[PDB]
């Protein structure tokens, strides 16, 4: 029985995915914050 399987689950599901994980890691990159150079490191 052979059909469209493309309506069912999307693809475009996927990419938003996606979309939504890299805007977790900015959120996580300002978190980080630049180390300053003052420091020196060991």
Same mark, same amino acid.
Do not use: M, R, T
């Given at each position: 029985?052979?059909?469209?399987?493309?309506? #069912? $689950?999307?693809? /475009?599901?996927?990419?938003? !995915?996606?979309?939504?994980?890299? #805007? $977790?890691?900015? /959120?996580?990159?300002?978190? !980080?914050?630049?180390?300053?150079?003052?420091?020196?490191?060991?």
């Amino acid at each position: 029985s052979a059909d469209d399987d493309n309506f #069912l $689950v999307p693809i /475009a599901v996927g990419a938003a !995915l996606a979309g939504v994980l890299i #805007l $977790v890691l900015l /959120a996580y990159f300002i978190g !980080l914050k630049h180390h300053h150079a003052g420091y020196e490191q060991f």
